[PDB]
Design a protein around this ligand. Structure first.
Ligand SMILES: C=C(NCc1c(COP(=O)(O)O)cnc(C)c1O)C(=O)O
Ligand SMILES: C=C(NCc1c(COP(=O)(O)O)cnc(C)c1O)C(=O)O
Lengths: 468, 468
């Protein structure tokens, strides 16, 4: 029915949490997993991450103890999502925001915190926690150098795990009806795993809690698991640190699973492809850990995995196939790039132009009157023409006639005004996979040497694939 | 409480809709608006847009009439969000997706539909609806050329407005308790405004419904309002077309408001800044139309505005200040760029280096053993040093000591391994606003002519601002 959103909300802070739980049946059937893999889709909060909760939570504590007055400044070291949550809380309740984040993190987090009126100081990636050039040391320096400033310190504030123990874990319990067999959850500050695992083990002691730690971090138990890539920097954002945060109670977690970059990203793309959950990379790490840890489970049992982050924060980073190819990561089992590699292979546009059958595409200087160009088009019997300057684009008779009827194309007007201006350049040595990726962004694809041989669209490639 | 998400969900299709309504008090107080401006945050659906609903909806109709079997292909012309919704439905229920979208639309929509296993054919921006190079004409051609393909045709399918009449309008009614005085809603295909306005006027006849149409479109009534920029292409995505779609009942809408690009984008950024709703540009258009139309309303009355789209689809486009400066759009009344322009003005780093007070920053060839570099650092009494090749980065004694303790820095190892590798180049003629924007992405900022004068961080700029 409708209980929680059935009224009007006072601010965006009231739209945090209350996240649905979805059964990933298709993904389980893909990976050959017998049990029910439930996903807590924390990326669907108003701010698009689980950390929103603690952001809100901490401010509430700072307000329930009277420690915070209007106009104050908030400083917080973060990998990006807590900065967003605290920035939301500050823009709503009238506080000043300063974020300290490492250079490793994405630019979308930075831009979104900038739209929320927050100052952004970035710190070097390779700095240790002890360095005063660390995000935490720089935040401490800013607290020392700024008046009416406060560091809420999500690494040591009890609100961070207390709210995952109060509401989120209670959410997971009430939607799974108490029956939980495994919980796989990423270990960043460790607040989410601590709080959720504690509440669940209190209400369901037979539940195993699995912590996910990236290869490079030192949070897993024992240290014989962390020595794969000791303190080697990784790309996944959100989990793992070079120290044990104050809120992390590693004794409440039973197992530890090590997950690397390649597995995390390919499984995140698998989640998007097979379930349709616009999810982040750390959630790929958590789901890979869950698929490895819950392999021994049976049907009927429920393994709950946290999906912390939304794709919005890594929209240019790993959603783009260009960047995952530049970082040498296997795209996915079933993906568009591998599909194009399978169908096209090494076929180049030379092969298509040869199999179809003289580069006699008419050309005009792009400032002809439309009357002269239609006379040339009717005398040459071709339908399309290419306009270029001393390249401009393509121009069809259909658009000519319809825009003359529409009141957009004058008789004495230059053909530059009505030609199609979005184009993509190619050359015969190019493969067909690359022209398909180019067709993802541009309607036409034209060749050159300046002697162009023709125009290439998606239906031409479909016809070529039909000949195979 | 918890009614709708209190269980486990079968797929992401069940997480569509059920969107909360938030009162934009801060934004109303900013613009000087007396009434309650309620926002239906359709961008919080699982797919991040209102169109998810109709996407789901249409498939359901196509399944309830038995017209759709497993393995079929779905073709759909879209500005991007319906393509996403239908791609979600296809990935869940096992259908093949082909999207036809104009080149005007963002690349995030394309990439996200590619991650959902959908083929993407793009069409020219300037093409009219009649052209067979139009998104609709190309979709028709693909339907003619492909077997087991179906076009659900959101422009003419009754599911599109029927579901906004069945659930979404009923949602708005049940959360506003029947009392609605104005509804401002964007006119794209017109399905959302038709359905919602019809249901609301049926349940509350005293309600005015305001349609928003971008300057360039021909959907507003009368035509004396559309002649600002007749058929001139615009940047906002989602609303307005060169024809009246089949589902648009322009007689059920009372007013029409014309909103241009500049107003839409600056108001979208204002929404993000003042309310903290990660919202899209079309929602800026709708909110600007609402602020203009509901100006005559009183406190107590409720003006409901639709927020169709999520910022995720325009993350690189208009969230980035670079692109809004390149398109000559006023950033916002209160924004970080204008704040930096106010505090810094025309001050260049020459002025800061002069006011602070000899460019004697030590340099090393970036392959010295750490022992030699620490001896040089102790003999020069400086703390930081700059490593460069035949630029590499910066290197501090704090990181030296802590990483030697950490097991990451050998005695005979080269200083390249432990130096900070993320850097930003500047030159003395650069303004301070530009170095602040650069500091949004990089921890340090160093100058050059190759003679570097020093390193610049955020605390240095804070100190300079403290001297003013
Ligand atoms: C460390 C931070 N985030 C934690 C996090 C996590 C781990 O959540 P924890 O509450 O820190 O255990 C997983 N995924 C993402 C994307 C995350 O951002 C932060 O916001 O400073
Ligand atoms: C036209 C399409 N979207 C409609 C839309 C609208 C208008 O919604 P309509 O249901 O078409 O009236 C507003 N904002 C955005 C971002 C939109 O995408 C489409 O998905 O093809």
């Amino acid at each position: 029915a409708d209980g929680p959103y059935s009224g009007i909300l006072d601010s965006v802070l009231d739209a945090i949490g209350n996240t649905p739980m979805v059964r990933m049946k298709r993904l389980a059937k893909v990976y050959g997993l017998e049990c029910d893999l439930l996903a807590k889709c924390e990326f669907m909060s108003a701010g698009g991450s689980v950390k929103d909760r603690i952001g809100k939570a901490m401010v509430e504590k700072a307000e329930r103890e009277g420690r915070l007055k209007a106009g104050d400044t908030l400083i917080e070291p973060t990998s990006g999502n807590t900065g967003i949550g605290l920035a939301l809380a500050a823009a709503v309740r009238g506080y000043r925001m300063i974020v300290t984040m490492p250079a490793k993190m994405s630019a979308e987090k930075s831009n979104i915190m900038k739209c929320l009126g927050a100052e952004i100081v970035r710190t070097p990636t390779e700095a240790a926690w002890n360095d005063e050039n660390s995000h935490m040391g720089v935040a401490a320096k800013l607290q020392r150098e700024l008046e009416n400033a406060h560091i809420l310190d999500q690494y040591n504030n009890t609100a961070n795990p207390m709210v995952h123990y109060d509401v989120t874990a209670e959410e997971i319990i009430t939607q799974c009806d108490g029956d939980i067999d495994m919980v796989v959850i990423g270990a960043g500050t460790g607040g989410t795993i601590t709080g959720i695992g504690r509440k669940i083990k209190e209400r369901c002691p037979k539940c195993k809690v699995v912590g996910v730690d990236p290869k490079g971090s030192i949070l897993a138990v024992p240290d014989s698991l962390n020595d794969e890539k000791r303190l080697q920097s990784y790309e996944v954002e959100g989990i793992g640190y070079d120290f044990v945060p104050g809120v992390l109670d590693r004794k409440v977690v039973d197992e530890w699973v090590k997950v690397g970059d390649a597995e995390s990203f390919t499984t995140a793309r698998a989640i998007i492809r097979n379930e349709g959950l616009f999810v982040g990379g750390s959630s790929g790490a958590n789901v890979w850990g869950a698929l490895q840890a819950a392999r021994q489970l049976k049907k009927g049992q429920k393994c709950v995995v946290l999906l912390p982050d939304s794709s919005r924060n890594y929209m240019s980073k790993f959603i783009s196939d260009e960047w995952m190819a530049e970082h040498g990561f296997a795209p996915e089992d079933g993906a568009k790039v591998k599909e194009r590699e399978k169908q096209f292979g090494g076929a180049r546009i030379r092969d298509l132009l040869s199999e179809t059958g003289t580069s006699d595409v008419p050309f005009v200087t792009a400032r002809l009157s439309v009357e002269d160009v239609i006379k040339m088009m009717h005398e040459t019997k071709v339908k399309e023409v290419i306009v270029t300057e001393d390249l401009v684009g393509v121009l069809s008779e259909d658009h000519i006639a319809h825009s003359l009827q529409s009141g957009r194309c004058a008789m004495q007007s230059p053909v530059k005004d009505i030609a199609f201006k979005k184009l993509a350049k190619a050359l015969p040595s190019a493969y067909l996979r690359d022209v398909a990726k180019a067709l993802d962004f541009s309607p036409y694809v034209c060749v050159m040497d300046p002697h162009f041989l023709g125009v290439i669209t998606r239906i031409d490639l479909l016809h070529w694939l039909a000949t195979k």
